[PDB]
Design a protein around this motif. Sequence first.
Motif, mmCIF file in Angstrom:
data_model
loop_
_atom_site.group_PDB
_atom_site.id
_atom_site.type_symbol
_atom_site.label_atom_id
_atom_site.label_comp_id
_atom_site.label_asym_id
_atom_site.label_seq_id
_atom_site.Cartn_x
_atom_site.Cartn_y
_atom_site.Cartn_z
ATOM 1 N N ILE A 10 0.822 -1.212 0.000
ATOM 2 C CA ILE A 10 0.000 0.000 0.000
ATOM 3 C C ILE A 10 0.857 1.264 0.000
ATOM 4 C CG2 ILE A 10 -1.584 1.402 1.386
ATOM 5 C CD1 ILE A 10 -2.971 -0.854 -0.042
ATOM 6 N N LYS A 11 1.921 1.262 0.797
ATOM 7 C CA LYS A 11 2.845 2.395 0.812
ATOM 8 C C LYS A 11 3.463 2.623 -0.571
ATOM 9 C CE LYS A 11 4.669 6.024 2.177
ATOM 10 N NZ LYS A 11 3.816 7.131 1.614
ATOM 11 N N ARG A 12 3.803 1.538 -1.265
ATOM 12 C CA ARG A 12 4.330 1.632 -2.636
ATOM 13 C C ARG A 12 3.304 2.255 -3.575
ATOM 14 N NH1 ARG A 12 6.029 -4.600 -2.036
ATOM 15 N NH2 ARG A 12 8.040 -4.278 -0.967
ATOM 16 N N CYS A 13 2.041 1.865 -3.414
ATOM 17 C CA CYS A 13 0.988 2.354 -4.299
ATOM 18 C C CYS A 13 0.592 3.797 -4.021
ATOM 19 C CB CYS A 13 -0.256 1.472 -4.187
ATOM 20 S SG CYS A 13 -0.013 -0.241 -4.677
ATOM 21 N N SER A 14 0.871 4.276 -2.810
ATOM 22 C CA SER A 14 0.445 5.623 -2.408
ATOM 23 C C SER A 14 1.089 6.749 -3.219
ATOM 24 C CB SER A 14 0.734 5.846 -0.925
ATOM 25 O OG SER A 14 2.125 6.037 -0.752
ATOM 26 N N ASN A 15 2.113 6.429 -3.998
ATOM 27 C CA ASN A 15 2.752 7.439 -4.828
ATOM 28 C C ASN A 15 2.229 7.438 -6.263
ATOM 29 O OD1 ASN A 15 5.255 6.049 -2.937
ATOM 30 N ND2 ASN A 15 4.617 8.172 -2.565
ATOM 31 N N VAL A 16 1.341 6.493 -6.571
ATOM 32 C CA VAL A 16 0.739 6.405 -7.898
ATOM 33 C C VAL A 16 -0.474 7.332 -8.051
ATOM 34 C CG1 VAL A 16 -0.372 4.893 -9.578
ATOM 35 C CG2 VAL A 16 1.462 3.991 -8.103
ATOM 36 N N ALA A 17 -0.495 8.107 -9.138
ATOM 37 C CA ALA A 17 -1.629 8.977 -9.458
ATOM 38 C C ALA A 17 -2.826 8.236 -10.052
ATOM 39 C CB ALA A 17 -1.194 10.105 -10.387
ATOM 40 N N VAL A 18 -4.010 8.613 -9.596
ATOM 41 C CA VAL A 18 -5.245 8.010 -10.071
ATOM 42 C C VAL A 18 -5.481 8.442 -11.508
ATOM 43 C CG1 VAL A 18 -7.744 7.993 -9.831
ATOM 44 C CG2 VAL A 18 -6.305 7.902 -7.808
ATOM 45 N N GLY A 19 -5.274 9.726 -11.769
ATOM 46 C CA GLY A 19 -5.453 10.273 -13.097
ATOM 47 C C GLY A 19 -4.121 10.528 -13.758
ATOM 48 N N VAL A 20 -4.107 10.484 -15.082
ATOM 49 C CA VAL A 20 -2.866 10.640 -15.837
ATOM 50 C C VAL A 20 -2.349 12.096 -15.782
ATOM 51 C CG1 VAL A 20 -4.038 10.863 -18.051
ATOM 52 C CG2 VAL A 20 -1.671 9.898 -17.980
ATOM 53 N N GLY A 22 0.008 14.452 -12.961
ATOM 54 C CA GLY A 22 -0.179 15.872 -13.191
ATOM 55 C C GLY A 22 -0.588 16.560 -11.902
ATOM 56 N N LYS A 23 -1.876 16.871 -11.813
ATOM 57 C CA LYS A 23 -2.470 17.457 -10.614
ATOM 58 C C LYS A 23 -3.116 16.378 -9.756
ATOM 59 C CE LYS A 23 -4.300 16.766 -14.264
ATOM 60 N NZ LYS A 23 -4.832 15.437 -14.686
ATOM 61 N N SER A 24 -3.351 15.229 -10.380
ATOM 62 C CA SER A 24 -4.221 14.181 -9.858
ATOM 63 C C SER A 24 -3.982 13.754 -8.404
ATOM 64 C CB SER A 24 -4.152 12.957 -10.774
ATOM 65 O OG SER A 24 -4.795 11.846 -10.173
ATOM 66 N N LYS A 25 -5.051 13.331 -7.750
ATOM 67 C CA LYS A 25 -4.951 12.739 -6.426
ATOM 68 C C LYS A 25 -4.223 11.394 -6.560
ATOM 69 C CE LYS A 25 -9.160 13.759 -8.321
ATOM 70 N NZ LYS A 25 -8.978 12.887 -9.521
ATOM 71 N N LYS A 26 -3.595 10.930 -5.486
ATOM 72 C CA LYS A 26 -2.936 9.628 -5.487
ATOM 73 C C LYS A 26 -3.852 8.576 -4.868
ATOM 74 C CE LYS A 26 1.334 11.423 -6.439
ATOM 75 N NZ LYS A 26 0.668 12.709 -6.790
ATOM 76 N N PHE A 27 -3.541 7.300 -5.092
ATOM 77 C CA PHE A 27 -4.310 6.196 -4.518
ATOM 78 C C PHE A 27 -4.126 6.145 -3.009
ATOM 79 C CE2 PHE A 27 -4.198 4.624 -8.876
ATOM 80 C CZ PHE A 27 -5.448 4.022 -9.005
ATOM 81 N N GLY A 28 -5.175 5.740 -2.292
ATOM 82 C CA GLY A 28 -5.088 5.536 -0.850
ATOM 83 C C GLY A 28 -5.507 4.119 -0.483
ATOM 84 N N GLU A 29 -5.139 3.676 0.719
ATOM 85 C CA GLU A 29 -5.428 2.313 1.174
ATOM 86 C C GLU A 29 -6.894 1.923 0.987
ATOM 87 O OE1 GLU A 29 -4.147 1.503 5.130
ATOM 88 O OE2 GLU A 29 -4.556 -0.635 5.011
#
Length: 130
Positions: A10-20, A22-29
């Motif tokens: 989950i910590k690894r994924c928390s740096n991934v953007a939901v949207g392509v 840019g400004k996008s929010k990142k994934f959360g647990e």
Amino acid sequence: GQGRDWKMAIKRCSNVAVGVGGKSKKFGEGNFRWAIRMANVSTGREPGDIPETLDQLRLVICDLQERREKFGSSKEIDMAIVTLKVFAVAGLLNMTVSTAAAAENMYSQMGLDTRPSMKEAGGKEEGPPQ
């Protein structure tokens, strides 16, 4: 879905953007728990069933894409699918991807959308409960 391996993924994924962006929010647990739960109910699994291995996660994703093919796409099933692919690529495989789109692309290029046969898999996962 409470152990140290889960949290590191989950910590690894928390740096991934939901949207392509840019400004996008990142994934959360919570996004991952939602996606797993949605896929579980949709495919007739016990709702709290957490995939422990990449092979188990791949089979969930496979079942869910086959459902999408049979009954049709939607904003919700699409989001669940891509979220699970982010979990596979950024979480379980620890691969740097910037966006969910990039994870989806990597998941596809690595051949993971293919549903392996049982013989191909070598054997289902059969181990102790605790």
